Design an enzyme around this catalytic site. Structure first.
Site: not given
Ligand SMILES: [Mg+2]
Ligand SMILES: [Mg+2]
Lengths: 139, 165
Positions: B98, B146, B10, B141, B8
Site C-alpha cells: 500500500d 480488511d 484495493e 476484499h 488499507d
Molecule cells: Mg491486506
Molecule cells: Mg484488501
C-alpha cells in the site's frame, strides 16, 4: 513435518552499492552466508549470484526477505533484481516493525535493545530481532 | 503523537507502472490500538476481475464519482486533523505494498506520515514460526473490513504472544 523448517527460513539482505545476504532458520540461527558484492560487477551478474544462492537455500516462493530497512530494500530489488525477488515470498519480516512495537509497548526493554558494511547491518538486525524475542515475546 | 495511521487499499493489480487505486480506507488508533477516529472510506474512479466482481467493488468503481485527487484531499485533510506532521507510521497488513502505491499516487498524504511502518504481516510471520499453536487460533476484499480485521489481528498477537506485564 518434513520441509516445514526449510519453508520457515528467512533471507536477510542489506544494501548500502554494497549488498549482502545471509540465511537463517526460523529461530534466527545463521545457516549460510551468501554473496557480499559491490554493484554499480554488473547488476545482472550480481542478481544471478544472489539468485543461485537463495535457490540452494530456500524453496521457491516460500521464504521472506528480512532486515531492518527491508521494505525499502525490497522496493529497490523488486525493480533491479526482479528474478531474485521472484524466488522469495511477498511478505517480509520487518525488524523495524517489531522495534516500533517494542518502543510503544515495552519502553523499559527498548532502552536496552541493540541499536556500516551491509553484512554488519544484517548481523545487528538479527541480534535486534533476537533481543525482541528474548525480552518482549511470551516465554 | 504516538498514534497510528491504519490504511488499507484495493487496486486493479500489483503492477505499480499500470495499476491504480480503486478503494481506500483509513483509521486512527492510539499506540495501544484503540480506534480514535474513523477516516474516509472511498471508492475511486483474471483473479482481480473475479474477486472484485464479487464484493461489488468493480460495480461501485464504475458508479463512483470520486477522483484520485478528491480522495487524496479527503485523506490528507483527515490525517492533518488527526496526527502531527511527520511523526506517525502507516499501519496495516499489506502496508508496504500500500505504501508503494501511496508514495506514487498520494505523495502529500505520505509526506504527512513518518517513514516507519507497522507491518502486521511481519508479526504474523513471526507468530507462525514461534507460536504456531496461537497462530492457528488467530484472526470480503473491501478496504474498511480488511483494515478492521488487521487491527484485530495485531491485537490478538499482542494478547497472546507478547509477554505479559
Ligand atoms: Mg491486506
Ligand atoms: Mg484488501
Amino acid at each position: 513435518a518434513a520441509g516445514e523448517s526449510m519453508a520457515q527460513r528467512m533471507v536477510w539482505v542489506d544494501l548500502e552499492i554494497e549488498m549482502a545476504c545471509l540465511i537463517t532458520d526460523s529461530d534466527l540461527n545463521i545457516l549460510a552466508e551468501g554473496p557480499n558484492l559491490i554493484i554499480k560487477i554488473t547488476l545482472q551478474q550480481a542478481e544471478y549470484e544472489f539468485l543461485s544462492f537463495v535457490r540452494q537455500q530456500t524453496p521457491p516462493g516460500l521464504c521472506p526477505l528480512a532486515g531492518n530497512s527491508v521494505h525499502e530494500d525490497k522496493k529497490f530489488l523488486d525493480k533491479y533484481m526482479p528474478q531474485f525477488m521472484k524466488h522469495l515470498h511477498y511478505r517480509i519480516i520487518d525488524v523495524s516493525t517489531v522495534k516500533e512495537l517494542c518502543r510503544r509497548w515495552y519502553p523499559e526493554e527498548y532502552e536496552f535493545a541493540p541499536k556500516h558494511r551491509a553484512l554488519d547491518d544484517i548481523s545487528e538486525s538479527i541480534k535486534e530481532l533476537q533481543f525482541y524475542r528474548n525480552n518482549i515475546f511470551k516465554k
